[PDB]
C-alpha cells in the first residue's frame, strides 16, 4: 500500500532505501502461481468465473528457492504490493534494504546470470499496465548497473518496442537524474473519478481495487502522515529535504 | 365447443360427400371418387358449398351409408337452408338417421325441401 502510493522516482527509491528485504518476502503459504481456476463473482454471474492465477497478483504465492525467485519476489512487491513464500533466506540478507540488494555488491548476492526476458515473461509483462511496466524497468536498470550489464539492458529494450517508449530516464549512480525525472509511477492514489465499493471480475483487478479502497481509508487514517499540518513533529532524520541524496549517489 | 365432420364414401356411386358443421354453420363439398393419388383420399371437388376442413383431429367412428350420394346431397342442401332455424341436435339427428337408417326427417317442411 505504501509502496504503491509512491508517484515519483525520488519517493520510490527513498522508500526502497528504508525498507528491508523482509517486507518483500511473505511468510504465508499461498498457492502455486500458474493455474487455471474457477473463482466466485456473485455480483456479476451465477456460474463460477474462470481465471488464471499469476505472480503479480496481490496475494502471496509459493516461490522458488533460487536467486531468481528472490528478485521476482522483489519486483512483485513493487508492482503488486505483496511478495512470495521463500523461507530460510537468512538474517544477513533479510536485514538489508531492497535498494542494497538491487544495487550493491557488498550484500553477498550474485545476480549477473539473470535473464531479463525470462523474468519478464514469468512476471507476465503482457498483463502489466503502464505504471507496472515502468516500475519493473526501474528494477532492471538498478540490477544492470550493479552487474555492469548496461549494454545488455539497452539491447533488451531494443527488442521490445513498447518497453523502450516508457523506459524511465535516470542514471543509477547520479542523484541529479532522479530529481529531474517527472514520470508518474503511482498505482494507488486519490481518485478523480467515482470509486465505488464494487467487486471486479479478475483476480488482479479485484485485488488492485482493494488496495485503492484501502489507500483511501489509509489516507484519512491517523497512521497517515500529513506534511502540511505536522511537519514540525517529524523527526529531523526522516524529515523531507530538498537536498535529499541517496548514499553513494 | 361442438364441431362435427362427415366423410361419406358411397360404394354404390361415383361421387363422395364431405359435410362439416361448426356450431350452426353447415358446409359441404362433393368430390370425385376417381383419379385419386395415394396421398389423399379425395379427388377434385365437383360441387362446392363452402369450406370443409378434413384435417380436424378427433375420434373417428366408422359407419356404412344406407343412402345414395344423391340422397345424402339432397338432405345436406335442405339442412343448409334451415341451419339458422334449427337446433344442432335436430341438424345432426336428421342427418345421422337418414345416412345410417334411411329414415326420412320427421319435420314435414324439411322433408319437402329435400
Amino acid at each position: 500500500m505504501d509502496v504503491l502510493s509512491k508517484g515519483s522516482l525520488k519517493e520510490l527509491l527513498a522508500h526502497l532505501e528504508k525498507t528491508p528485504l523482509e517486507e518483500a518476502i511473505s511468510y504465508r503459504i499461498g498457492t502455486v502461481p500458474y493455474q487455471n481456476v474457477l473463482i466466485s463473482r456473485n455480483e456479476y454471474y451465477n456460474q463460477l468465473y474462470p481465471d488464471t492465477t499469476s505472480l503479480i497478483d496481490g496475494v502471496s504465492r509459493e516461490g522458488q528457492r533460487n536467486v531468481n525467485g528472490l528478485i521476482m519476489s522483489i519486483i512483485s512487491y513493487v508492482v503488486s504490493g505483496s511478495g512470495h513464500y521463500i523461507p530460510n533466506i537468512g538474517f544477513m540478507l533479510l536485514r538489508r534494504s531492497i535498494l542494497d540488494i538491487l544495487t550493491k555488491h557488498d550484500t553477498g548476492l550474485v545476480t549477473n546470470n539473470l535473464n531479463y526476458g525470462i523474468i519478464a515473461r514469468n512476471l507476465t509483462v503482457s498483463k502489466m499496465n503502464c505504471e507496472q511496466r515502468k516500475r519493473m524497468l526501474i528494477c532492471f536498470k538498478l540490477l544492470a548497473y550493479k552487474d555492469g550489464n548496461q549494454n545488455d539492458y539497452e539491447i533488451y529494450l531494443n527488442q521490445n518496442i513498447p518497453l523502450k517508449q516508457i523506459a524511465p530516464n535516470f542514471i543509477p549512480g547520479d542523484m541529479r537524474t532522479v530529481i529531474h525525472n517527472q514520470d508518474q509511477l503511482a498505482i494507488v492514489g486519490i481518485p478523480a473519478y467515482r470509486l465505488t465499493q464494487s467487486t471486479e471480475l479478475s483476480i488482479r483487478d479485484d485485488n488492485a481495487k482493494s488496495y485503492k479502497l484501502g489507500y483511501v481509508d489509509w489516507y484519512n487514517s491517523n497512521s497517515f502522515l500529513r506534511e502540511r499540518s505536522e511537519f514540525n513533529l517529524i523527526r529531523l532524520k526522516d524529515r523531507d529535504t530538498k537536498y535529499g541524496k541517496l548514499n553513494g549517489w | 365447443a361442438s364441431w362435427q365432420l362427415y366423410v361419406i364414401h358411397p360404394v354404390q356411386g361415383s361421387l363422395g360427400l364431405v359435410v362439416q358443421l361448426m356450431g350452426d354453420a353447415l358446409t359441404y363439398n362433393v368430390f370425385a371418387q376417381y383419379g385419386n393419388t395415394s396421398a389423399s383420399e379425395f379427388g377434385k371437388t365437383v360441387l362446392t358449398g363452402g369450406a370443409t376442413n378434413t384435417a380436424l383431429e378427433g375420434t373417428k367412428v366408422k359407419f356404412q351409408t344406407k343412402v345414395t350420394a344423391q340422397q345424402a346431397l339432397a338432405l345436406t342442401m335442405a339442412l343448409k337452408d334451415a341451419a339458422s332455424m334449427l337446433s344442432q341436435g335436430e341438424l345432426i339427428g336428421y342427418f345421422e338417421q337418414y345416412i345410417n337408417l334411411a329414415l326420412e326427417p320427421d319435420n314435414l317442411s324439411l322433408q319437402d325441401n329435400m
Partner: protein, 34 residues
C-alpha cells in the same frame, strides 16, 4: 363457429339400460333372436 348449444351433448349421453324397462325389454328380445 357460432355458439354451441347443449342439444348435441345430451344425445350422446349414456343411458341406464337396466333401470329403464323399455331398454331391458329390447335387449332381451335381440339376445333371444340371435
Amino acid at each position: 363457429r357460432t355458439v354451441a348449444d347443449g342439444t348435441f351433448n345430451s344425445m350422446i349421453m349414456p343411458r341406464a339400460v337396466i333401470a329403464n324397462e323399455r331398454e331391458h325389454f329390447m335387449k332381451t328380445r335381440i339376445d333371444k333372436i340371435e
